[PDB]
Subunit: 116 residues, 3 copies
């Protein structure tokens, strides 16, 4: 690639004296900046800002964590956080509550939330 | 100075431009990339931008390290259309591991400020 | 450290002209690619693909957010996302529900999930 670093353990270190470290940017709103984790150069997970249309009011460009199968093919977004609302979706592409889960929910201490 | 890779006009200490796989860091043991800071009050950050405007960041904050693993908590921040912070969508407390959603100071293993939706029912299953 | 960058501000910017960005890769299935956050070069947090073995059917290599103590020693996995199922664990390295929490749960608005 443009930059290819090889090492053992600590491959690269980016040191900030303020707020910074690694910026991942794209040249257009339709291109998704991504941090991609691979093993033996096969996709396993990524965290990226997706291409959901930026329609105003801070909508679009939501944060997604994608999982990939053993061959590197997408299995979908396990987490989607919407930028306009902050709503946190688990197995839910369109979260509609501050936490929104599609499927089952397990809690080791009881069946209810504590009113905080 | 500044080092550009693919740009003759770099704007940070290192500035790399590519198409698709811009940079690949390969480790021959468990490991990878480190984001570090020169002092405890400086915040190592992973920042995502589009067209060089902030959108999201995952960073270690400057909550003070007062002992017993206090301070330096993780936060996932969202940013508005102009690139200004909208706040921490997620805050994870380092000392306790408590996971806050829209909650700056989580006090439960999961702590949500706002609403909660579950497709299958209104109760958690006791695990 | 093969590459060591220090800056005021952003430190390092990686710009993609298509969907893509930064790849953290390993040379073997048992070498875990990691993004490690340090202060003064002491571990504080990481996001990494974990050591669960890839035994087939997308098992193993789950995504973890780890928290470290003030000396840099591992304190725990705050979050683990299962690759084969997408299940989201909080304080649970082997989640068995779409959201699985070990410990307590607090909700500011009430005791129940809304049925979505």
């Amino acid at each position: 690639s443009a930059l290819h670093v090889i090492g053992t353990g600590e491959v690269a270190r980016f040191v900030t004296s303020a707020t910074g470290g690694v910026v991942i940017d794209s040249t257009a709103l339709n291109y998704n900046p991504s941090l991609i984790y691979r093993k033996t150069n096969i996709n396993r997970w990524s965290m990226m800002v997706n291409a959901a249309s930026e329609t105003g009011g801070n909508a679009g460009s939501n944060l997604s964590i994608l999982r990939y199968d053993d061959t590197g093919a997408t299995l979908g977004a396990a987490v989607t956080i919407d930028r306009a609302s902050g709503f946190f979706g688990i197995n839910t592409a369109a979260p509609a509550y501050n936490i929104h889960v599609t499927g089952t929910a397990g809690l080791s201490t009881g069946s209810a939330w504590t009113v905080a």
